[PDB]
């Protein structure tokens, strides 16, 4: 009976592959061949946010595009003011091994997590003028890689236990557990409508999920190694993935297959962070070789290099209005480029 | 813009608190990664003091923080990249169990050659030396079964055996160390070094050994920094 199930899985995969090939009437590379190249784009460090005393492992931009939160291994969660380099808050973390952080769309909440298996929600808009742990979300059996806020009530997180969970902050319990990944889930990305989200894991596969029902809808493959980063295309019907094979892959939810390949023979180190800018024409990817190249998503080629970091570019996020992009790294500095 | 001056003053006081925390933290306080297997007595290393542990102890008024990550899965390649700024990796090895000693060697090799842990000097702790001695003295299990090179092995001339130690016990323990040192010196370069120590579940000198190797590690780092090494 197990052999029958394996045969059914194999024939389902073959049918999916055949459908993908049939839908592959043309190639996106040749379809975009008519697009004129933008040319070499130059982006310079506008702000350098110093004050962290250890590696910066994650950051998240605010919806206001003014305040950004950064997490560092020293045990601080600084809410900077990118415009004026002012540290609005500096939250002391109970566990210094923070691997992720999110800034709520409302702006009244910030989450963080890491090797403590706990997503700690912090209130930045308390009436007493301080920062306190709003809620200690517990229930994951692995390190938190990425957590994102749907709203001030719901937060979806990704763990190292191959599962993602949707939480209710007031309730403090897992509304829905997203099971199906085989390796550690390393990144999260929410669609602009917040009804679907993808999560690349350490199995060379990215899975598309539904937040409401709570089951995997589309499993994407095509990577050669552990996927470390993932983000949705601004249209919301596509996403990009960065992995250890020094290659970025763009997928389509509708087509359900790989579209393009963002790799070069000169880049050997893997990717740690991927983020579209505002229109899905620029794909900024952070590599371990201390700089984060800028790739033209449409032209599927490299059209810029963002050098200036003295260590691995762990985190890379773009403003929600497209006016800037911040690149935190292990050198204890966030550089905002424009 | 009075709000701007207020925000700037708050940023200045915040930065002052950050700097004060940095001094009080990175001064006579060192971070260590306590790593090992379930069988290895990693927990019972230093007798004198839900996702990650933290053991704090002092020797010469210098603080040490051991981080025992004991809640993640068995896939170690991603959460271990966080510990690339620690002073040392406290690798604990169970010398008695030769069956899992090969995978302990493989873990040591992966840590040594890891692209991020390639600058961290491992403080190797060959634990359960009493059990290893009892096993080799009984002779029910033979090391040359799990390693067909122990037969063509002799104890090093620089060995310092215990006075009440059997030559076979000394040969066995020094063979295991040299097996670890082989991986260490194959690709050790000059930025990180392995410090092996034969320790038991009763010896209370693990803290002093960690203190001395951390001193040696930091001294060699400083000598390299000032181009004296």
């Amino acid at each position: 009976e197990l052999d029958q199930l394996r045969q059914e899985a194999e024939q389902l995969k073959n049918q999916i592959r055949d459908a993908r090939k049939a839908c592959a009437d043309a190639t996106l590379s040749q379809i975009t061949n008519n697009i004129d190249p933008v040319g070499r784009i130059q982006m310079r460090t506008r702000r350098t946010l110093r004050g962290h005393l250890a590696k910066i492992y994650a950051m998240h931009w605010g919806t206001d595009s003014r305040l950004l939160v950064s997490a560092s291994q020293d045990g601080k969660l600084i809410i900077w003011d990118s415009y004026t380099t002012n540290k609005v808050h500096a939250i002391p973390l109970r566990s210094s091994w923070v691997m992720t952080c999110a800034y709520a769309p409302s702006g009244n909440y910030v989450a963080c997590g890491g090797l403590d298996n706990i997503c700690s929600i912090y209130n930045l808009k308390t009436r007493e003028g301080n920062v306190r742990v709003s809620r200690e979300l517990a229930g994951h059996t692995g390190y938190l890689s990425c957590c994102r806020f749907l709203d001030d009530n719901q937060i979806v997180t990704s763990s190292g236990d191959t599962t993602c969970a949707l939480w209710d902050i007031e309730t403090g319990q897992q509304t829905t557990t997203f099971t199906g990944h085989t390796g550690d889930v390393m990144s999260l990305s929410l669609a602009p409508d917040t009804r679907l989200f993808v999560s690349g894991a350490c199995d060379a596969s990215a899975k598309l999920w539904d937040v409401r029902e709570g089951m995997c809808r589309q499993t994407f493959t095509g990577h050669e190694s552990d996927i470390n980063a993932i983000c949705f295309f601004p249209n919301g019907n596509a996403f990009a993935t960065g992995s250890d094979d020094a290659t970025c892959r763009l997928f389509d939810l509708r087509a359900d297959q790989e579209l393009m390949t963002y790799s070069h023979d000169n880049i050997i180190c893997g990717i740690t962070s991927v983020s579209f800018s505002k229109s899905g024409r620029l794909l900024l990817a952070g590599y371990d070789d201390f700089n984060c190249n800028v790739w033209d998503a449409l032209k599927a080629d490299r059209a810029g290099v963002l050098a200036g970091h003295d260590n691995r570019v762990s985190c890379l996020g773009v403003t929600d209005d497209g006016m800037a992009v911040a690149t935190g790294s292990w050198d204890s500095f966030l550089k905002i480029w424009n | 813009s009075a709000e701007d001056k207020a925000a700037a003053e708050r940023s200045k006081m915040i930065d002052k608190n950050l700097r004060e925390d940095g001094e009080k933290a990175a001064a006579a306080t060192h971070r260590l990664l306590l790593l090992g297997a379930d069988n290895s007595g990693k927990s019972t290393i230093v007798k004198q003091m839900s996702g990650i542990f933290e053991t704090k102890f002092q020797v010469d008024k210098v603080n040490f923080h051991m981080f025992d990550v004991g809640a993640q899965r068995d896939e170690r390649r991603k959460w271990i990249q966080c510990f690339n700024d620690v002073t040392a990796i406290i690798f604990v090895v169970d010398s008695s169990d030769y069956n899992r000693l090969q995978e302990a060697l493989n873990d040591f090799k992966s840590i040594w050659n890891n692209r991020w842990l390639r600058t961290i000097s491992v403080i190797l702790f060959l634990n359960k030396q009493d059990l290893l001695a009892e096993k080799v003295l009984a002779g029910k299990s033979k090391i040359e079964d799990y390693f067909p090179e122990f037969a063509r092995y002799t104890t090093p001339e620089d060995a310092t055996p215990e006075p009440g130690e059997d030559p076979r016990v000394t040969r066995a323990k020094y063979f295991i160390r040299d097996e670890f040192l082989r991986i260490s010196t194959a690709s050790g370069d000059g930025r990180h070094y392995c410090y092996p120590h034969f320790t038991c579940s009763v010896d209370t000198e693990n803290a002093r050994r960690i203190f001395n190797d951390c001193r040696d590690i930091i001294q060699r780092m400083h000598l390299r920094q000032y181009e004296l090494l």
Partner: nanobody
Framework: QVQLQESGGGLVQPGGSLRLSCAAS????????MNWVRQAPGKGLEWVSD????????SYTGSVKGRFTISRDNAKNTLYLQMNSLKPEDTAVYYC?????????????????????RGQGTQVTVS
């Protein structure tokens, strides 16, 4: 999709030989360190052999040195393990798990319980 399918194995008397064959498609086989992982029935997975990207850093576990030999064909994207002179202790399921990342000399996680890049495996029985 990364795929690792093994062909070989079966029932052989002690002292016999078996050339296991793992076909690895989907990824650049010439760019990854490749391992052989075996799980004895009732025991955890044990790393049993290893090769390099080219095939010059070959290393073996102690229990099989002088008995097993590993070889990689870059063009054929296939790797083998000639398990000659097999002993009754060699009864296990053999996996051809590759390494998590290319260009690296460390294979940090290949004997884990739920490693992503293992093959299905071939049960090798010796009696």
């Amino acid at each position: 999709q990364v795929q690792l399918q093994e062909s070989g194995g079966g029932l052989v008397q002690p002292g016999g030989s078996l050339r296991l064959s793992c076909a690895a498609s989907g990824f650049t086989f010439s760019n990854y360190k490749m391992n052989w992982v075996r799980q004895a029935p009732g025991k955890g997975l044990e790393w049993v052999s290893d090769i390099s990207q080219s095939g010059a850093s070959i290393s073996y576990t102690g229990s099989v040195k002088g008995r097993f030999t590993i070889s990689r064909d870059n063009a054929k994207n296939t790797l083998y393990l000639q398990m000659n002179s097999l002993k009754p202790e060699d009864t296990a399921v053999y996996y051809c798990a590759r390494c998590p990342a290319p260009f690296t000399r460390d294979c940090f996680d290949v004997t884990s319980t739920t490693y992503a890049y293992r093959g299905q495996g071939t049960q090798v029985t010796v009696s």
